[PDB]
């Protein structure tokens, strides 16, 4: 960790931002100290009502003046809350932006050796893209919110203890029980959720391995143990979900009951103090509510400390590269700018080792002379760090031992400003920049005109990707629409190097894109551009090696031989090995509800529970208003009885909550968990039925599919269980509150009726204030972050051409747009929040004024205005949640999109077809008509061109891999992993696509290539090929596979975990189990697949005794790229790029003098 302290994180503050922070803090304190003052004014107006019941002259003036004070308070909140959101959020944008401009400069100042081509560059780009966002959260409006809510607590206590210290002390002493109950509830919820996830880590995870190893499960009957096991696993998750739903019960009910008891106690003490003669009704209420709010605000105040630690750590991580001192210092004074460059580069015993891994040695005793104005090249035997000279010449690593002389002048005695111009680099795949092609050329020389650009393009023939463009000299490679990669690229690096017109040029192995006509074109382009230059070429193939004046061959640390191509080929001096190696190369909601048809009895009893629970708020508000009126009785005798009755009402309501809440939250949880289990079972049953090719897509891999099937499905519950209880409860509370409010008094309730939109909008704004007004801050900064990431990932190219000063000229001019967007967002949010709060506090001063006016005329009476005001305000409070859940109702699929995306997806091949004819017996004949296929992952490949083959019944075939010319593709076409794009597949006198292949695959077996085993013991693993596992043939399988002397010799016997659990066996012995599983099936047709030398065991004691059983009485087809233990007996064919031309036994193939078998003989001799 070693995190930086919270202070000094503002160290990037301008002299103007301090004023912004000061104004923000000053506004925040005032905005936080407002609610208690609102309670004080409300208490004063209640006192004005109470004290003047028999004199309707003073009360009018008091209500008028207090309504005016409410108007003033609303104005203050309007002009204070705006200074908290408009001065803190903006100040959090002028610092992070001012920090990135320094951070990227620091990154681009360091040496290239710091990025040693690994995950370090990924870490740096992740820090740039994501970590600065975390820094921006610790200095944004979160600190303003924290100050706001702490000042609220302080002001509440102050406006508390001063009024009536006893009542405030009671109020602050009763809240610890509620806080402790809430903490216990949260801890229990977290523990139960963790236990549920750990239970989900049980066999409910085996779905991912079944999906990954889908080829083997489709090869056998499968689809039964893969689903029954999943159901048995998810049963436990269902049970723990029931327990979790229970936990969502007693916790909330007990908290509400303790709250109700506390309210009853505090009101009873207020009522016993009021009759003594200490305080008044308008003061005890003020003290109680101020103390309650002050106590409750501290919990929200401390909720912001979570992000502060992350922000501190993020700031510490950033403040590491900033203060780093570069190893190489660019001092213009030390280096004297020279001229008359010649091109003499000479080594003086330059031995260097990488600082990251100094154990290895790279250039032990390195001494080769580079002539001026002459072409030389160095070629290595293999890829043993060949691309190392380029880094050393361009000064990316300081030579620890040795010296490099440039025209007799040491490079270390020169500044790194004008030296880099003399060297041009074209490395392996020089990544272009996602800008216009016009300014890509300008990197060589910032000051250039169009004519030299055209001359450079013509020199490198940069016209086949430029002249015939949709628009002139305008194309963004990063943009998808004009993405013009197209495999090979007309290398613009050639043109940008020619623009410099240097005398030293560097070229790496830039031929790795299926050398073709375009490669030849760029080859003669290069041959044109090497004129009078000290070019150095590194490559592996000998095509470019021939066109070199002098060739240097290195083996390790030093050059083994020099001379020229005609000399190396002579006498085979240190060159026969080189050529030997070279030659060896939406209606969703209705149907979701319909899916819960068997949950009919568990929905009604939850709905009635929600309806019953909906009667909590209005009754509590009614009792509060009634007791508020009761406090002002003249005769003290009836007060005791009324308060006792109301305390009894509170005590009853506590148990009513401890009831109704559990009743609501239990059955709904049951229904949600049942729905999740059903949808998960159906999802797996549908995804396993899908075709093989849909699994091959890069978007659809095992990890993402498992994540969607494991995590996304849970959200379905939140879309059908939690999202329906709250709406019903709030709606019924709203209705039952309006009914009572209208019954009590209607002519005053109409004013509130006309003004619910204002109060609801204001409370919605208050609710949104807790989340933050910034909004999706990553989307705005993604465009800027792309520039930094692309400049860091391509550090090799930007290091040359002196492009460091140019990157921080587009970065600065592009960073300004998010700043303006943030400023506009901040201003709009502040103004709207201020207007909303003014509407809130400006409307409550009208209802009370009209109520007082009505009382003055005698039409209405006290105990009626206050009731309809309090109950209606409290019920308008609840509408905020209903409004907040609105955007996630109509806009379905926001997170719950996988529920029907793959469940209702239509397949092309249905394994179980009722109309398909059943398959009883098969003779075992394989033949293909004129059929070709293309992989669905990338249909551009068209290797198959009119493919045909035949294997007679009761025979064997020995197809050769033929250098991987689609060798592992015929294995996937004999049985229906894929479908023929054209032509017909012929078998057993019937077309393949009219028979029930589920009944057909049970008679055909194959052998896997890459070893893989299920997370289960090997008793049914070898019995997976048949239904019914009896030890009689279990031992027989081990004897046939010859694993009986090995598997049964294990100390723990057969009952042992062999997959990704318990003991992990070697990869060279999993083929024993693989071949043991096949013998149980005893298929009429057998398939083999050996490739990539998966055995790696000389004198195999497995294949020799198993292949003999393999041929006996079976039609076997074998494909392999190795001429070892693949001796055919009936017919052998050779495939060349998706086509065969010769057929017959091994005698015919060996009878050919040379034929196509000579190439296979070459590799056979290579095996030796
Ligand atoms: C934030 C949740 N929370 C802290 C644990 C609660 C929850 C409930 C209460 C009740 O006082 C209460 C609030 C409003 C309306 C009625 C009632 C009621 O009396 O049931 C409370 O004070 C605090
Ligand atoms: C003066 C009476 N009065 C104006 C009509 C109210 C009453 C209640 C609230 C609630 O916000 C509230 C206050 C404190 C604790 C919990 C809660 C709660 O959420 O139930 C309020 O804002 C204003």
From Swiss-Prot:
Sorted UniProt keywords: ATP-binding, Auxin signaling pathway, Brassinosteroid signaling pathway, Cell membrane, Glycoprotein, Membrane, Nucleotide-binding, Repeat, Transmembrane, Transmembrane helix, Transport
Activity control summary: Transport capacity is stimulated by the chaperone protein FKBP42/TWD1. ATPase activity is specifically activated by bioactive brassinosteroids in a dose-dependent manner, including brassinolide (BL), 24-epiBL and 24-epicastasterone (24-epiCS). Inhibited by vanadate.
Predominant location category: membrane
Domain ABC transporter: residue ranges: 345-581, 926-1162
Impact reported for residue 1090 to Q: Lost ATPase activity and reduced brassinosteroid export
Region (Interaction with FKBP42/TWD1): 881-1168
Cited InterPro entries: AAA+_ATPase (IPR003593), ABC1_TM_dom (IPR011527), ABC1_TM_sf (IPR036640), ABC_transporter-like_ATP-bd (IPR003439), ABC_transporter-like_CS (IPR017871), P-loop_NTPase (IPR027417), Type_1_exporter (IPR039421)
Upregulation: By auxin (IAA). Induced by red light, but repressed by far-red light. Induced by brassinosteroids (at protein level).
Chain sites annotated for binding ATP 1: 116, 354, 356, 385-388, 509
Glycosylation sites: 674, 701, 730
Superkingdom classification of source: Eukaryota
Transmembrane segments: 22-42, 68-88, 143-163, 167-187, 254-274, 288-308, 604-624, 648-668, 738-758, 830-850, 865-885
Catalytic activities: (indol-3-yl)acetate(in) + ATP + H2O = (indol-3-yl)acetate(out) + ADP + phosphate + H(+); brassinolide(in) + ATP + H2O = brassinolide(out) + ADP + phosphate + H(+); 24-epi-brassinolide(in) + ATP + H2O = 24-epi-brassinolide(out) + ADP + phosphate + H(+); 24-epi-castasterone(in) + ATP + H2O = 24-epi-castasterone(out) + ADP + phosphate + H(+)
Disruption outcome: Reduced rosette size associated with decreased brassinosteroid signaling. Reduced sensitivity to red and blue light-mediated leaf positioning and morphology associated with reduced auxin efflux, thus leading to constitutive upright petiole angles, and irregularly wavy and small rosette leaves. Aberrantly enhanced organ bending, including increased gravitropic root bending. Reduction in bulk stem auxin transport and lower levels of shoot branching as well as small increase in branch angle when combined with the disruption of MAX2 and MAX4, genes involved in strigolactone-mediated signaling.
GO process annotations (BP): acropetal auxin transport; anthocyanin accumulation in tissues in response to UV light; auxin export across the plasma membrane; auxin polar transport; auxin transport; auxin-activated signaling pathway; basipetal auxin transport; formation of plant organ boundary
A Pfam family that the UniProt record links to this protein: ABC_membrane
Family: Belongs to the ABC transporter superfamily. ABCB family. Multidrug resistance exporter (TC 3.A.1.201) subfamily.
Annotated function: Brassinosteroid exporter that, in conjunction with ABCB1, supports the accumulation of exogenous brassinosteroids (BR) in the apoplast, thus promoting BR signaling initiation involving the specific receptor BRI1 and required for plant growth and stress responses. Mediates the transport of castasterone (CSA) and brassinolide (BL) across the plasma membrane. Auxin efflux transporter that acts as a negative regulator of light signaling to promote hypocotyl elongation by mediating leaf tip to petiole auxin flux.
Quaternary structure note: Interacts with 1-naphthylphthalamic acid (NPA), and FKBP42/TWD1.
Annotated protein name in UniProt: ABC transporter B family member 19
Species per Swiss-Prot/TrEMBL record: Arabidopsis thaliana
Gene: ABCB19
């Amino acid at each position: 960790e070693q995190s930086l302290p919270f202070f000094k994180l503002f160290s990037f503050a301008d002299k103007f931002d301090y004023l912004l922070m000061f104004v923000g803090s000053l506004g925040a304190i005032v905005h936080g100290s407002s609610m208690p003052v609102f309670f004080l004014l409300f208490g004063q107006m209640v006192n004005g009502f109470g004290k003047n019941q028999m004199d309707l002259h003073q009360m009018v003036h008091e209500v008028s003046r207090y309504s005016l004070y409410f108007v003033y308070l609303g104005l203050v909140v309007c002009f204070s809350s705006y200074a908290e959101i408009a001065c803190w959020m903006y100040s959090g944008e002028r610092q992070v932006a001012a920090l990135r401009k320094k951070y990227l400069e620091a990154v681009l100042k360091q040496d290239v050796g710091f990025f040693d081509t690994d995950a370090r560059t990924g870490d740096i780009v992740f820090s740039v893209s994501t970590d600065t966002l975390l820094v921006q959260d610790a200095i944004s409006e979160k600190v303003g919110n924290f100050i706001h809510y702490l000042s609220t607590f302080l002001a509440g206590l102050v406006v508390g203890f001063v009024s009536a210290w006893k009542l405030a002390l009671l109020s602050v002493a009763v809240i610890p029980g509620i806080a402790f109950a809430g903490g216990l509830y949260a801890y229990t919820l977290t523990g139960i959720t963790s236990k549920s996830r750990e239970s989900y880590a049980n066999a409910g995870v085996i779905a991912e391995q079944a999906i990954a190893q889908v080829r083997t499960v489709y090869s056998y009957v499968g689809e039964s143990k893969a689903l029954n096991a999943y159901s048995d696993a998810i049963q436990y998750t269902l049970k723990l979900g029931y327990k979790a739903g229970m936990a969502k019960g007693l916790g909330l009910g007990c908290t509400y009951g303790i709250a109700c008891m506390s309210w009853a106690l505090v009101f009873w003490y207020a009522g016993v103090f009021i009759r003594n003669g200490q305080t008044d009704g308008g003061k005890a209420f003020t003290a109680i509510f101020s103390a309650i709010v002050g106590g409750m605000s501290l919990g929200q105040s401390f909720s912001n400390l979570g992000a502060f630690s992350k922000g501190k750590a993020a700031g510490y991580k950033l403040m590491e590269i900033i203060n780093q001192r570069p190893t190489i210092i660019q001092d213009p004074l030390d280096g004297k700018c020279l001229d008359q460059v010649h091109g003499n580069i000479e080594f003086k015993d330059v031995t260097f080792s990488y600082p990251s891994r100094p154990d290895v040695m790279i250039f032990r005793n390195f001494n080769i002379f580079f002539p001026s104005g002459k072409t030389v090249a160095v070629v290595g035997g293999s890829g043993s760090g060949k691309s190392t000279v380029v880094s050393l010449i361009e000064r990316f690593y300081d030579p620890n031992s040795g010296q490099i002389l440039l025209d007799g002048v040491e490079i270390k005695t020169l500044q790194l400003k004008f030296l880099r111009e003399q060297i041009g680099l074209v490395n392996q795949e020089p990544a272009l920049f996602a800008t216009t092609i016009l300014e890509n050329i300008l990197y060589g020389k910032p000051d250039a005109t169009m004519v030299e650009v055209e001359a450079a393009a013509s020199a490198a023939n940069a016209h086949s990707f430029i002249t015939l463009l949709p628009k002139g000299y305008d194309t963004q490679v990063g943009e998808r629409g004009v993405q013009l990669s197209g495999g090979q690229k007309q290398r613009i690096a050639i043109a940008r190097a020619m623009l410099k017109d240097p005398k030293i040029l560097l070229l790496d192995e830039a031929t790795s894109a299926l050398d073709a006509s375009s490669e030849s074109i760029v080859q003669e382009a290069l041959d044109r551009v090497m004129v009078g230059r000290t070019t150095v070429v590194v490559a592996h193939r000998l095509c470019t090696i021939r066109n070199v004046d002098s060739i240097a061959v290195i083996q390790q640390g030093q050059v083994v031989e020099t001379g020229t191509h005609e000399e190396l080929i002579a006498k085979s001096g240190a060159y026969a090995s080189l050529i030997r190696f070279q030659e060896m190369v939406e209606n969703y909601f209705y149907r979701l509800l319909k899916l819960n048809s068997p949950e009919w009895p568990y929905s009604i009893m939850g709905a009635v529970g929600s309806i019953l629970s909906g009667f909590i708020g209005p009754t509590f508000a009614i009792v509060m208003s009634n007791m508020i009126e009761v406090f002002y009785y003249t005769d003290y005798d009836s007060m005791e009885r009324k308060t006792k009755e109301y305390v009894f009402i509170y005590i009853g309501a506590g148990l009513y909550a401890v009831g109704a809440y559990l009743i609501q939250h239990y059955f709904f949880s049951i229904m949600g968990e049942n729905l999740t289990t059903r949808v998960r079972r159906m999802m797996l049953s549908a995804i396993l039925r899908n075709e093989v090719g849909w699994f091959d897509e890069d978007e659809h891999n095992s990890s993402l599919i498992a994540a969607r099937l494991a995590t996304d499905a849970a959200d379905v519950k939140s879309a059908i269980a939690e999202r329906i209880s709250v709406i019903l409860q709030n709606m019924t509370s709203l209705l039952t509150s309006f009914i009572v409010a209208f019954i009590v008094e209607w002519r005053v309730s109409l004013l509130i009726l006309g003004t619910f939109p204002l109060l609801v909008l204001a409370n919605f704004a208050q609710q949104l204030s807790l989340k933050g007004f910034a909004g999706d801050t990553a989307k705005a900064h993604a465009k800027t972050s792309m520039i930094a990431g692309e400049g860091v990932s391509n550090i090799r190219t930007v290091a040359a051409f002196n492009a460091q000063s140019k990157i921080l000229s587009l970065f600065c001019h592009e960073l300004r747009v998010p700043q303006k967007r943030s400023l506009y967002r901040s201003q709009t949010s502040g103004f709207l929040f201020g207007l909303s709060q003014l509407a809130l506090y400006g409307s409550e001063a009208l209802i009370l004024w009209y109520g007082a006016h009505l009382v003055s005329k005698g039409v209405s009476t006290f105990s009626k205005v206050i009731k309809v005001f309090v109950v209606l305000v409290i019920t308008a409070n609840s509408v905020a949640e209903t409004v907040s859940l609105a955007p996630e109702i109509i806009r379905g699929g926001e997170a719950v999109g996988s529920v029907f995306s793959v469940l209702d997806r239509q397949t092309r091949i249905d394994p179980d077809d009722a109309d398909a004819d059943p398959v009883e017996t098969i003779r075992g004949d394989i033949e293909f008509r004129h059929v070709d296929f293309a992989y669905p992952s990338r249909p551009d490949v068209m290797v198959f061109r009119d493919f045909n083959l035949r294997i007679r019944a009761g025979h064997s075939q020995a197809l050769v891999g033929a250098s991987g010319s689609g060798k592992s593709s015929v294995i996937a076409m004999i049985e229906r992993f894929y479908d023929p794009l054209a032509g017909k597949v012929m078998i057993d006198g019937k077309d393949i696509r009219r028979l029930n292949l589920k009944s057909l695959r049970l008679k055909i077996g194959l052998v896997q290539q890459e070893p893989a085993l299920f997370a289960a013991t090997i008793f049914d693993n070898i019995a997976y090929g048949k239904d019914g596992a009896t030890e009689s043939e279990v031992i027989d399988a081990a004897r046939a596979a010859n694993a009986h002397g090995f598997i049964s010799g294990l100390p723990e016997g057969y009952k042992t975990p062999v997959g990704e659990r318990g003991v992990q066996l070697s990869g060279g012995q999993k083929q024993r189990i693989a071949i043991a599983r096949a013998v149980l099936k005893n298929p009429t047709v057998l398939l083999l697949d050996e490739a990539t030398s998966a055995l790696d065991a000389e004198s195999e004691c497995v294949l020799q005794e198993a292949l003999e059983r393999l041929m006996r009485g079976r039609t076997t087809v074998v494909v392999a790229h190795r001429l070892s233990t693949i001796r055919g007996v009936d017919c052998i064919g050779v495939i060349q790029d998706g086509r065969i031309v010769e057929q017959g036994s091994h005698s015919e193939l060996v009878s050919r003098p040379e034929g196509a078998y000579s190439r296979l003989l070459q590799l056979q001799t290579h095996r030796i």
